[PDB]
Amino acid sequence: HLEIISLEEISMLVSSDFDLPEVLQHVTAKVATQLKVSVCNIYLREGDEVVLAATHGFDPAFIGKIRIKIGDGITGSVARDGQYISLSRASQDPRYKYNSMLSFPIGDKKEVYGVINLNTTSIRSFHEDEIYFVSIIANLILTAIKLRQQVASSR
Amino acid sequence: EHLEIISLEEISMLVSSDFDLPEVLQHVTAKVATQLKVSVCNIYLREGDEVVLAATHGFDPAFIGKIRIKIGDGITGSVARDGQYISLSRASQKYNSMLSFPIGDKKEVYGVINLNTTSIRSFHEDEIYFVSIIANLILTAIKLRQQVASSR
Ligand code: NA
Ligand code: NA
């Protein structure tokens, strides 16, 4: 939402005394609650795949554990192509579900660094600026990485 | 605390692709001035043995080229050299209060952000914080633009 990011928040995000791990935990937990969604994950490009880096929705236990091969999911396509997809599906496993997800890339000019997902179990449309809001977050996340990775291991 | 005093596109432009340093700074100033309800906000950043004016709110923007301060020199010089910021009040005559805060990192000072009122007020712990934050924001606005350009 409009004026909806604390000074503490951008602060922590930029200021380098924190490690990605801890920021991203707070990022997902921020986004998930802001958009009223029941889970928000970040996967970060690593080799030809993409591994989980933060959650709000899963156990933190799952942090290293989930990997999507590159083109593989619809996460995997977002990771490959760098266009986000948002969809709602009707789903039914036999038994004598109607979810929504938003899957948005983290990337730049050159390429994709990761994917942020938002999944709610309700049938619900993602509104434009709802996506705008995540677009900004995808870029604050992009900026966290860039500051830390390069300006740390080379400065 | 630290109240919800920043805006999505403000944030955005800060980081953004083809949003541009002068212009970004020209807004950053105008925000601070307007926020801390201060008369002038000027950012000087670093060139060689001196520090030049990069953005103002409060002066004619025609002075952006034009004000260069040696690192030994101002109250602004000290802040630029030894990195730890200074804030003062003078009653001088009329009068003025000011905050001269550093922009930098563990090793290196990148410039100085400056506020002056033409009242006589000493700024709150919380008001400085804000500015410290604003100074990381400027710092990284800077830091991004040269890791993109000057390392590709
Ligand atoms: Na997911
Ligand atoms: Na000044």
What residue ranges define each of the domains in chain B, with the CATH number in brackets? 1-152 (3.30.450.40)
A112 contact partners, CB below 8 Å, separation of at least 6: A45, A79, A80, A82, A105, A106
The answer to whether the CB of B114 falls within 8 A of the CB of B101 is: yes
Closest partner residue to A3 (CB to CB) among B4, B16, B144 is B4
Find, in chain A, the residue whose alpha carbon is nearest to that of B10: A3
Amino acid, res. A64: G
Closest partner residue to A136 (CB to CB) among B12, B129, B133 is B12
Give how far B33 is from chain A: nearest CA, Å. Answer: 17
A71 contact partners, CB below 8 Å, separation of at least 6: A77, A79, A80
Solved using: X-ray
Q: How far is CA B71 from the centre of its chain?
A: 16
Output b/e per residue, B52-79; b: 16+ Cβ within 10 A: bbbbbbbbeeeebeebebebeebbbbbb
Distance from the first to the final alpha carbon of chain A: 35
Amino acid, res. B139: L
What's the helix, strand, coil split of chain B in %, to 5?
40, 25, 35
Alpha carbons A34 and A116: distance in angstroms, whole number: 15
A62 contact partners, CB below 8 Å, separation of at least 6: A52, A55
B143 and A147 within 8 Å at the Cβ level: the answer is yes
Q: Which tokens sit at B121?
A: 């007020």
Give how far A7 is from chain B: nearest CA, Å. Answer: 6
Alpha carbons B104 and B43: distance in angstroms, whole number: 13
- Tell how far the Cα of A73 is from the centroid of ligand 1, in angstroms: 10
Q: Which tokens sit at A34?
A: 């802001």
